[PDB]
């Protein structure tokens with residue numbers, strides 16, 4: 184998918200997690216987020232279209248996805264241990280990584 | 290790209306790291322390894338084609354890629370820090386993650 | 396090496412990072428913060444004095460220090476690659492983790 | 502505890518995991534290993550006792566404990582999701598991290 188569609192997948196699944204009843208709903212949504220983040224990895228965003236892939240700016244852009252992917256990994260372990268509310272709350276904290284990238288690169 | 294071509298990218302760049310004679314060659318190889326691992330995320334290997342996408346087997350397959358991606362992240366920081374031989378040596382330790390997934394799933 | 400004193404060390408060194416002129420001051424403060432977090436890992440907080448060491452609350456308490464330690468680790472790598480303003484801004488983001496534990500257990 | 506007692510705790514609980522009869526034994530042993538690793542973090546080993554705390558060797562020594570602590574963290578999550586065999590096999594893999602530090606500093 185393109186970068187726009189992977190971002191819509193991240194936004195919509197965050198909302199499904201906040202309104203979940205059960206563990207099954209939370210796990211499935213985190214798995215969809217992990218796939219979207221991994222597919223987005225080598226996208227060039229509009230703001231950096233004149234830069235090389237090996238520039239400081241593109242190395243920094245990719246660093247944001249490493250962090251996001253790490254956080255989704257941990258939240259999914261919480262959900263699979265039966266700590267559903269702890270997983271929802273970790274999902275709420277992911278938003279600061281979202282905002283950090285957007286303020287520099289969007 | 291498909292799974293077999295992602296694996297050939299991982300294998301070539303591990304050899305570049307070993308024969309490297311400057312820091313730039315090591316940084317560039319690790320970056321290519323990270324891109325290939327993120328692109329492999331979503332693949333279904335031949336041996337698990339008769340399982341569901343949400344099967345315990347496929348969840349465990351994907352967990353191996355989370356582990357590899359995390360180890361590459363740390364190796365790249367070491368290289369950028371000036372600790373280049375330490376980065377090469379950490380790259381050699383990646384082999385046990387490669388071997389673990391192959392024994393279970395290849 | 397009691398909990399109160401480890402917390403003073405966390406708070407003091409965060410202010411140092413916020414006011415620093417140079418990269419040496421940031422690296423030293425981050426290293427002191429990691430020491431204090433590792434030293435706090437095994438403490439029993441006053442609010443959980445009545446609980447089993449194996450309770451869900453105490454497992455969760457310890458998990459919070461693992462999260463803080465991982466974030467400090469990343470910020471120090473950024474400082475060591477010359478991305479000093481980025482390490483400073485990352486140190487500021489630590490406050491979300493500080494306050495998440497405080498709201499549950501302080 | 503001193504460094505020698507922390508290493509005896511690490512060695513003993515690794516054999517406990519290998520020979521475990523049930524899941525509770527594996528979780529307990531991992532939690533004890535994490536405590537010992539966190540307590541060892543600030544120790545000065547005999548081979549480095551004459552160099553300064555800011556030396557590259559002490560920085561590097563401490564980094565190896567961060568790596569060990571992260572691997573125990575992931576293995577405890579696997580045990581708590583019910584993947585206890587996988588947690589046992591992950592614990593076996595820790596040995597290469599133990600051996601790497603011993604090769605360099607013991």
Ligand code: HEC
Pocket residue numbers: 186187188190191193194197228229244245247248251277278280281282284285288289
């Ligand atoms: C960089 C490392 C990013 C991270 C981490 C996240 N996002 Fe993002 N997002 C990013 C860019 C560069 C853009 C602009 C893309 C463009 O072509 O215009 C976006 C955009 C969005 C959007 C909406 C705009 C659109 O797609 O048309 C949304 C809704 C969005 N991003 C959501 C989002 C969420 C929920 C994140 C974390 C969970 C997140 N993003 C992380 C770059 C990056």
Ligand code: HEC
Pocket residue numbers: 292293294296297299300303334335350351353354357383384386387388390391394395
């Ligand atoms: C699972 C999580 C894996 C990890 C981690 C790594 N590899 Fe892999 N590799 C995997 C599978 C399932 C397969 C079989 C692919 C097939 O279609 O048959 C492979 C294969 C390879 C190959 C052979 C490629 C071919 O065309 O047959 C190589 C050379 C290879 N893998 C290398 C490799 C390296 C160097 C890794 C780590 C650095 C690594 N792999 C990790 C699954 C997984």
Ligand code: HEC
Pocket residue numbers: 398399402403405406409440441456457459460463489490492493494496497500501
């Ligand atoms: C739990 C996982 C915690 C994290 C992460 C952090 N803190 Fe904390 N802090 C915690 C507790 C249980 C307490 C109460 C201590 C008591 O005995 O009553 C505290 C306390 C503080 C204090 C006040 C200390 C005092 O003199 O009473 C400060 C100033 C403080 N904490 C700061 C702090 C900072 C800056 C953190 C992150 C950078 C942080 N804490 C994380 C539990 C936990």
Ligand code: HEC
Pocket residue numbers: 504505508509511512515546547562563565566569595596598599600602603606607
């Ligand atoms: C450095 C970062 C280390 C890691 C990771 C591990 N070990 Fe270690 N170990 C280390 C040192 C410097 C020493 C020497 C201590 C001394 O004063 O001589 C050790 C020693 C041991 C010992 C022997 C203790 C003794 O009788 O003197 C054992 C049995 C041991 N270490 C086990 C061990 C295990 C099982 C580890 C991982 C699971 C491990 N160590 C990691 C430094 C470091």
Ligand SMILES: [Cl-]
Pocket residue numbers: 600601604
């Ligand atoms: Cl080694």
Ligand SMILES: [Zn+2]
Pocket residue numbers: 257260458574578
């Ligand atoms: Zn965790």
Ligand SMILES: [Zn+2]
Pocket residue numbers: 259260263348352582
């Ligand atoms: Zn899992």
Ligand SMILES: [Zn+2]
Pocket residue numbers: 250279280283488
């Ligand atoms: Zn961030």
Ligand SMILES: [Zn+2]
Pocket residue numbers: 283484488
């Ligand atoms: Zn930010």
Ligand SMILES: [Zn+2]
Pocket residue numbers: 297298301
């Ligand atoms: Zn090739």
Ligand SMILES: [Zn+2]
Pocket residue numbers: 363366468472564
């Ligand atoms: Zn590191």
Ligand SMILES: [Zn+2]
Pocket residue numbers: 242365366369476
């Ligand atoms: Zn970097």
Ligand SMILES: [Zn+2]
Pocket residue numbers: 385386389591594
């Ligand atoms: Zn492994």
Ligand SMILES: [Zn+2]
Pocket residue numbers: 389590594
């Ligand atoms: Zn294995």
Ligand SMILES: [Zn+2]
Pocket residue numbers: 246249362366469472
């Ligand atoms: Zn990083």
Ligand SMILES: [Zn+2]
Pocket residue numbers: 272276495
């Ligand atoms: Zn919170």
